[PDB]
Structure 1
Amino acid sequence: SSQIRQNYSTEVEAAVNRLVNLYLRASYTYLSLGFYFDRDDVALEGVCHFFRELAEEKREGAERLLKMQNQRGGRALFQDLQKPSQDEWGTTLDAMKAAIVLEKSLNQALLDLHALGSAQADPHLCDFLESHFLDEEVKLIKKMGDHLTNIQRLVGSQAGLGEYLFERLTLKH
């Protein structure tokens, strides 16, 4: 019954709300990853920095979705935020593997929403996703795949040495 709402299905509105939840969940995951790498018994500052910056990015993603929801005349609805999947994240390798799984999950959710927008004939949504989300996920996933490759080549017969060098020479300088 919005005065402005036009060509904006209830189905898309609902899916946008679910995606917001997924992005806040991802932000929460990165916050946890960040503080894990900041533990005195883990102490990989560059890895902490990588994940803390991702927490911010995911939060910004959610906020961008919510703004758009309002611009189209939809109603934000928030749900419980489930805690991250792990309390301890193991090695940089383990963490980066978990990060790529997470981003692929987000990406597929974006792709699903794009498909719904296409089916509903909502070119504004499709443009919005294209402009602000799809390329960002692709670039991020490529960068994470890059990191994983480099971590894997390093962590050979001397795993600790490799983990230190990656953090020192690839991450946060």
Structure 2
Amino acid sequence: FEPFEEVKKELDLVPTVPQASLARQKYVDESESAVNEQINVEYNVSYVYHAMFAYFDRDNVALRGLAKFFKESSEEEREHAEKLMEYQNKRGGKVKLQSIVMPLSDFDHADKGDALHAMELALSLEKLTNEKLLNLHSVATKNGDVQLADFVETEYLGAQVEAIKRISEYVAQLRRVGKGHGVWHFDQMLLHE
């Protein structure tokens, strides 16, 4: 091994124009795009959770535990997006934030009750996010990006499994306690959890 002989083809590949990443290495456009797509997925879920917070924070709904949970969840989802934005820049890809569509605003449900409906929606959104994460992982693996696949596994896939179980447990408890007094009590639990 001769660093100065083998580093030559590396020093000649150092970008000249100011707009090109100096760090980018073995990071293909398809991977860059998939990371941007996931940033948009996380940001969308953040926005949906913020909508759910705004619903449960209504005076006539008055489920303070669920409001707090969705408010904190929204904040956490934004962090998930930001971590991906930072990762994008670590790899020398360019972050491209995309539009975020209007979420629903009302989360009432006659049969299920608002709490259960909202938690079932949250569970489905977390499972949807997991599918998107597995897709980002598929793009990494298809393109042979070893470090991207590891990043997704280490920072996202495990936590997503945990998030899914946590919400699943909420759905289960909400189904057990039933509407009315039980839901209010579950909400108190969540308020103080």
**TM-score bracket for the superposition, by shorter chain length:** over 0.9
* TM alignment of 1:2-41, pairs within 5 A: 2-41=21-60
- AA at the equivalent of 2:56: F
Query: Runs of 4+ in structure 1 displaced over 2 angstroms?
Result: none
Which residue of structure 2 lines up, in the alignment, with residue 103 of structure 1? Answer: 126
The structural deviation recorded for 1:163 is 1.1
1:62 pairs with one of 57, 81, 84 = 81
Give unmatched runs, 5+ long, in structure 2.
1-19, 109-113
Q: Which of 130, 133, 140 is the equivalent residue of 2:156?
A: 133
Structure 1 residue 115, shift from structure 2 partner: 1.3
CA deviation map 1:2-24 (0-9, x unaligned) = 32211101001011111111111
2:94 pairs with 1:75: yes
Match of 2:8 in 1: none
Identity %: 39
Give the TM-score, by structure 2 length. 0.84
Structure 1 portions without partners, runs of 5+: none
1:52 pairs, out of 48, 67, 71, with: 71
Q: Any idea what the Cα deviations from partners look like across 1:45-74, whole Å, max 9, x if unmatched?
A: 111111111101110000000001001010
Q: How far apart are residue 118 of structure 1 and its match? A: 1.1
Distance 2:133 2:91 in 1: 18
**TM-score, normalised with respect to structure 1:** 0.94
Structure 2 counterpart of 1:120, from 135, 143, 146: 143
Q: How far has the Cα of 1:154 moved from its partner? A: 1.2
- AA aligned to 1:145 is S
